[PDB]
C-alpha cells in the first residue's frame, strides 16, 4: 500500500479536493513529493484570495513570479495592498479573464488603467463599492480591451455618461450589464447601449437617473432575458407593455419600488408573458386582482413576491394558489391585512407552494437542527 505509486494525475485529482489552507499547511509539510505536487500550475490561476485582510501584503509579486498564466483573480473585501500590488500583477499576468475587486476602497483609477493596458484579452470586470473610480480610467478600459462580456459598476458615484459612451462604442461582445444607484447616468447611455450592443442578456439600472424615454429604447434587444428596473425616476406604464410584448425572451422582471405601476400592467404581462419565470412586485399599488390575473391568465410562473403593498388582502393569495398551474413562491413579507390563521391551513393545504411571511421565522429558527447548543 503506497500512495506514491499512483500516477501524478491521480494525486493531482486527490489534492484538488482539498482547500488552500489544508494544501499549504498540511500536505506541503509531509514530503517533498507532495510539496512539489501542490505547487503545480493548475492549483494556481484560480487565486481567489478574498477575505484575507492581514494576509495579502506586498506579496502578489511573489505569487505571480513563481506562477504565471493566471486566468482568474478574486481580491474582494481586501484591505492591505496598495495600488501598486495590482498594477504590477497585470504587468506579469497577460491572461486575466475574471478580475473581481469588490468593495476594496483603497484602489483608484490607475489599477483599472494598468489592468486594461496590460491585459488585451479580458472578459469580466466587477468592481463594487469603490468610490474613487472616475471616467478617466473607464475610457482606457473601453478603448483598449474589446473583449469584455460582463461588467459590474455598482455604487460608484463618479461614473457619468461620458465614460459609459466610450465603453459602449467598443466592447461589442457585451452580454450582461449591472448598474446600481449612481447618478450622472441618464437615458443618453441606455439609448446607446441598445444600438451598439445587440448581444445583451442581463440589464440592471437600479436607482439610476433613467427615464421611460430611454427605457423604451430596449425593445431593440431581441436577446433580453432579465430586467432590474427598480426605483427609477419615471417609467410611465405603456413602456412596460411595449417592452414585455416585443422581447419574447424575458425570464425575470424585477420592476420594483415603482409607485405608478398599476394592476393592468400585471394582467397584460400575465396574458402575454410566455417565457416569464421571475416576477418581482414590492410596494406597488396592486389591489388583490394582480394575483388573480397571474394565476389565471399566465401559464409559466414560479415566484411572486408581492410585499409591502398597502392594498393586499386575503382571497387573493388563496385564489392564485388554486388558479395558477405552477407556483413555487408566494412571498407576502409585511402584507399587514393577511391573517396568520389563513396561511397556516393554506400552507398545509398546498405543500408545493412555500410562502414568505414575517411569521415564517421558524424556517430560519430551524437551521439550529445542525448546531443547536443554544437553549
Amino acid at each position: 500500500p503506497d500512495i506514491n505509486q499512483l500516477p501524478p494525475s491521480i494525486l493531482l485529482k486527490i489534492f484538488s479536493n482539498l482547500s488552500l489552507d489544508e494544501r499549504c499547511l498540511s500536505a506541503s509539510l509531509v514530503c517533498k513529493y507532495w510539496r512539489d505536487l501542490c505547487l503545480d500550475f493548475q492549483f494556481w490561476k484560480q487565486l481567489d484570495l478574498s477575505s484575507r485582510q492581514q494576509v495579502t501584503d506586498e506579496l502578489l509579486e511573489k505569487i505571480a513570479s513563481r506562477s504565471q498564466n493566471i486566468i482568474e483573480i478574486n481580491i474582494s473585501d481586501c484591505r492591505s495592498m496598495s495600488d501598486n500590488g495590482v498594477c504590477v500583477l497585470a504587468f506579469k499576468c497577460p491572461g486575466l479573464l475574471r478580475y473581481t475587486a469588490y468593495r476594496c476602497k483603497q484602489l483608484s483609477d490607475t489599477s483599472i488603467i494598468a489592468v486594461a493596458s496590460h491585459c488585451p484579452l479580458l472578459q469580466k470586470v466587477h468592481v463594487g463599492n469603490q468610490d474613487k473610480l472616475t471616467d478617466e480610467g473607464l475610457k482606457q478600459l473601453g478603448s483598449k480591451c474589446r473583449e469584455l462580456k460582463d461588467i459590474h459598476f455598482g455604487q460608484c458615484y463618479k461614473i457619468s455618461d461620458e465614460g459609459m459612451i466610450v465603453i459602449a462604442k467598443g466592447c461589442l461582445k457585451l452580454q450582461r450589464i449591472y448598474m446600481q444607484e449612481n447618478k450622472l447616468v441618464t437615458d443618453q447611455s441606455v439609448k446607446a447601449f441598445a444600438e451598439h450592443c445587440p448581444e445583451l442578456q442581463y440589464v440592471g439600472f437600479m436607482g439610476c437617473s433613467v427615464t421611460s424615454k430611454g427605457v423604451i429604447h430596449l425593445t431593440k434587444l431581441r436577446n433580453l432575458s432579465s430586467l432590474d428596473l427598480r426605483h427609477i425616476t419615471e417609467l410611465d406604464n405603456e413602456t412596460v407593455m411595449e417592452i414585455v410584448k416585443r422581447c419574447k425572451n424575458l425570464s425575470s422582471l424585477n420592476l420594483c419600488l415603482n409607485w405608478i405601476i398599476n394592476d393592468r400592467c400585471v394582467e397584460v404581462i400575465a396574458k402575454e408573458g410566455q417565457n416569464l419565470k421571475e416576477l418581482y412586485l414590492v410596494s406597488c399599488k396592486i389591489t388583490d386582482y394582480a394575483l388573480i390575473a397571474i394565476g389565471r391568465y399566465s401559464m409559466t410562473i414560479e415566484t411572486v413576491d408581492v410585499g409591502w403593498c398597502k392594498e393586499i388582502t386575503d382571497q387573493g393569495a388563496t385564489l392564485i394558489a388554486q388558479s395558477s398551474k405552477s407556483l413555487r413562491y408566494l412571498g407576502l413579507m409585511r402584507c399587514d391585512k393577511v391573517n396568520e390563521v389563513t396561511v397556516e391551513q393554506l400552507v398545509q393545504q398546498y405543500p408545493h407552494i412555500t410562502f414568505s411571511t414575517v411569521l415564517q421565522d421558524c424556517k430560519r429558527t430551524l437551521e439550529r437542527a445542525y448546531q443547536m447548543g443554544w437553549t
Binding site: 500500500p1 500516477p7 491521480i10 479536493n17 499547511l25 498540511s26 506541503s28 510539496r35 484575507r52
Partner: protein, 146 residues
C-alpha cells in the same frame, strides 16, 4: 445486448451492454470499431476489482449525468475496504475511464487526508519523513500567509 469480458488471471464475466457502456473506453471501442462474441481481455484488471466495478456500475445504471461531501451511503458502505483494494479500484477506474468511481474514490482518499496533522498522515499512508529541519522550517515559513 450482452458483452463478455475477461480478467487478468483468467476469469470470464458476462454483463449487459448498457452496464459496460458506463466505461468510456469500452463504449468508444463498440462505437468506432464495428460477430461470434468472444472474451474481450482486460490485462490491467484482475478478478476481485472487476467484480467490484461490475457491482458498482450495476447499481449506478440510472444516475442522470448533468469538493463535495455528499458521498451517498451506498458508496461509503461499498468502499469499506483496505487501502490496497481502494487504490486498485482507483487504478481500474482510471484504466476503464469511469468518472463516477474515480470521483468517489478520490473524495474518499481526500477525506482520509482531511483533518489530520502531517505526522498522522505519515502514519496513515506510510510515508517516510524525508524533510530536513531547515527545509521544513522554510516550507512552513513560506506558507505563513495561509
Amino acid at each position: 445486448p450482452s458483452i463478455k469480458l475477461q480478467s487478468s488471471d483468467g476469469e470470464i464475466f458476462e454483463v449487459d451492454v448498457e452496464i459496460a457502456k458506463q466505461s468510456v473506453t469500452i463504449k468508444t471501442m463498440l462505437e468506432d470499431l464495428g460477430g461470434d462474441d468472444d472474451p474481450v481481455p482486460l490485462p490491467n484488471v484482475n478478478a476481485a476489482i472487476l467484480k467490484k466495478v461490475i457491482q458498482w456500475c450495476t447499481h449506478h445504471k440510472d444516475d442522470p449525468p448533468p469538493r463535495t461531501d455528499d458521498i451517498p451511503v451506498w458508496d461509503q458502505e461499498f468502499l469499506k475496504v483496505d487501502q490496497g483494494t481502494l487504490f486498485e479500484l482507483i487504478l481500474a477506474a482510471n484504466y476503464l475511464d469511469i468518472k463516477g468511481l474515480l470521483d468517489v474514490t478520490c473524495k474518499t482518499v481526500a477525506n482520509m487526508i482531511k483533518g489530520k496533522t502531517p505526522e498522522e498522515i505519515r502514519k496513515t499512508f506510510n510515508i517516510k519523513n524525508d524533510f530536513t529541519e531547515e527545509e521544513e522550517a522554510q516550507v512552513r515559513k513560506e506558507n505563513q500567509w495561509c
